[PDB]
Amino acid sequence: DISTLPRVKVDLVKPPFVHAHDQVAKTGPRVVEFTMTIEEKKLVIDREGTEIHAMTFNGSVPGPLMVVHENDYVELRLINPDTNTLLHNIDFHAATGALGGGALTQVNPGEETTLRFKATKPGVFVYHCAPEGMVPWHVTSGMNGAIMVLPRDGLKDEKGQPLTYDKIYYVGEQDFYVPKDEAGNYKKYETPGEAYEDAVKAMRTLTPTHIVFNGAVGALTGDHALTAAVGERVLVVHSQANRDTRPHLIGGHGDYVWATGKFRNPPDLDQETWLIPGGTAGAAFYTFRQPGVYAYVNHNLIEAFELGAAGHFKVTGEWNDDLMTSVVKPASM
Amino acid sequence: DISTLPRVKVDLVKPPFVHAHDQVAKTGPRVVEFTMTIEEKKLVIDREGTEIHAMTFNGSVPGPLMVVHENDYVELRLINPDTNTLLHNIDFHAATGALGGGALTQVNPGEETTLRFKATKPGVFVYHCAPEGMVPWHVTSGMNGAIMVLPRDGLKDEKGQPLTYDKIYYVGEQDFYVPKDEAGNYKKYETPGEAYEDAVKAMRTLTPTHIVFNGAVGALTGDHALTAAVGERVLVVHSQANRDTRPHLIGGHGDYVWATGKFRNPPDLDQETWLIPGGTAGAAFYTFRQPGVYAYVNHNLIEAFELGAAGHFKVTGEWNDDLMTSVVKPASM
Amino acid sequence: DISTLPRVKVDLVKPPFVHAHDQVAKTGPRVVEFTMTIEEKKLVIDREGTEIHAMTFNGSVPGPLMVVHENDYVELRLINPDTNTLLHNIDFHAATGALGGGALTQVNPGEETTLRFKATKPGVFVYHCAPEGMVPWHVTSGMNGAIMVLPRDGLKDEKGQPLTYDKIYYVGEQDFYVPKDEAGNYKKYETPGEAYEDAVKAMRTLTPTHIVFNGAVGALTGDHALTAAVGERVLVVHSQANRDTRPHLIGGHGDYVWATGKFRNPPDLDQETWLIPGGTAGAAFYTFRQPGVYAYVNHNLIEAFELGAAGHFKVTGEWNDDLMTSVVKPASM
Ligand SMILES: [Cu+2]
Ligand SMILES: [Cu+2]
Ligand SMILES: [Cu+2]
Ligand SMILES: [Cu+2]
Ligand SMILES: [Cu+2]
Ligand SMILES: [Cu+2]
After folding, report:
1. Region C1-151: CATH code
2. Which of A55, A104, A234, C68 has CA atoms 20 to 30 A from the CA of A313?
3. Cβ atoms of residues C187 and C180 within 8 Å
4. CATH code of domain B152-318
């Protein structure tokens, strides 16, 4: 049976970008093959040069977004090179059985493995590393990403009418818990193992030191802001593998939102802000109507503006005065 | 076009009360004009006399509730008198473009401005101050409120049947982060600027020192409890501009609840407790069936009973023994 | 009227198990009688022997799950034996009036009382102790449980088709705040009253020291794991009386989920993780398709793996290779 199915190999791209795919399936079920290489590496996460030992899927935080269709088979080749120091594995919330695949994918440095699973449910799901005994440490070190399982006939609104996006971006939100000394300065370590004991004490406080989008404070700002034009329909997939978040587009809305990200449910309309529970991926669809800069944020404003959970969208086009206008510009009373 | 539309000026009232309005629109689209004056002032927030420098819209925490209908134009005159010390602005989650109006409304002390925007989406939305660089500080100092955009044909249940309320109250929930000395006593400052540096360190802990309704511990209790009678239908609008909350009416329910507050979505029925994400306004409809005192609370009971997030409802009417009755009054075994 | 109704006495069972009942009602409305005895007792909650003075309904944390049908009358006999030291009462979120019954059920040691209320709304609800002035202390000491009010015609899916479970389990999640000394070691007390002052200071930090299922770290693991077989439909009721949680079945899904637990609303489909607000009970339905061990967790992984919020399911049956298979077992590159 599977033997007889067609197979296509797909090369992943770095977040916030997403690999090429079809919204409405043009072929029947296939075996979609992906390859990911584990990379343990130092990462500076803020302006002051704070550095951590990140554990990544393909060298990025978050790991890349995989896109398949309902009932395709996902075949993943997972490689843990001998240059790494720790055992890793992968748990797909999209999969059924063996702890999401975690029990079947344990690889020490120098090993690789190939897992296959059937994508039976449509929606966006979180995938993350989960080794017995050190699950939170690997997850909060950036070892998580997401997979989107699109219905074979694409996305639909509450009335069952088609929703087609022109652009899609993947925003992975990460809560970090950097160990601190007595005065409050962040500690630095030579290897991941040296950090272990302190990491556990830092996590138990339940208070992140940093909460960032795309691995670093300001990662999606300035020259890295997300782009769009007035009239374009944009799908924003957002994931948080360990902690709740409440996304919000400043100056815009979520026209259609699947906060818990499962496509067989009708979306919520006109959301100002929505809650994505820790351990979940969600998606929001919006059509831009005004040009300018928009701030995309976690709406606990302390987490957004003090801790790092803020990004930008720069949109081009003509301003619509009917929607909004400054009647009297700021001036002396 | 707008030139030709009728205009009505509306005078706002202090929370928890709401200005007069029509549920079902009797006229066509209009330009609804409001005026708000910014007021920086000292506020004692608890029984022990803890004082803070609040930043308010119209002298209250939360700012007043504005009520318009879908497709009306909101025209707001915002005045920042010379008696204030800081730059302020306003961001309406109900608006589209320019950061909700934040980029078009920056006024220093002694200035004013007039913004107009089209209310294209029905629901309850949060509005708040958001100056570049000090967003969380202004929000957590009480500078936020809400606006309700009613469908032109009023509220409806899941089956599309009309829902008419007899009374409406606005509960604004506020998380405060008062700086403390080494022993745990709250600090006091002469001006807002003197508090700034300490405020930022207090916010980064992510742990509020107070969480109150209507600006102070016990604000909606005793002689200030909300009132109703058995048989009355009450709509309770609740907003939290920075942090999640989980409202609950002790002894009652939320018969119809729009937790994320957007009216084009059908409401949830029979809720015991519901989650309103930080940066959102929600609404719950309930018909009183028993007289007596009801406690309206944030259901994290520590936040409610230790931190200040609790209010009362005193309802008049006849007791219904079919619904509830004490069969055997407390007595010695 | 009530005089004329049939009455049935039901003996409760210890969580995670649930007392015998009918899903679809075979008789008309009845007066269902229950008896609960309050028990103040020492409980060791972790591996290191940390001990607390728990306040319980029937000797367990959580208290037992009560199951009735819509429009039955619940008649509860509540006994507070003279061996206890504190005043207690009970508040049913399922009830209407008198603070959920809290104002009618205050019993000092040596007293008892009998309350009756009509179960007018279907769903799973939280019930908990709530004495004036010490509400959070009694709740966070384990004095809470849940009641399920089933529609008279059983559970249904989004299309109104019947959903019948073969097994049902009740998972009560508890956040504990154990007082600590300067070095971080947990304190021990002789009686509940001796703990009082320190308990309040511990709660105000808003940071639990332990978050457990069924009263202790590892309570639902090893020989106490929940059981099922491939093909069985299982309903898992989960409650959190004071704090938000985000349940997740590792290796599975929530096929039908009522996150806020009210049955008149259609369930959410295919959830990976769902949010149950503090002060609420929810229910998830799933059909097992793969055998093996599954971890049932609160998906804030620090709370699950560091703090205690983790349990197991051991399922028997044949492995399905179509759903998942290890193509290449872990081996040297
Ligand atoms: Cu790993
Ligand atoms: Cu997971
Ligand atoms: Cu301001
Ligand atoms: Cu905002
Ligand atoms: Cu008690
Ligand atoms: Cu309660």
Report:
1. 2.60.40.420
2. A55
3. yes
4. 2.60.40.420
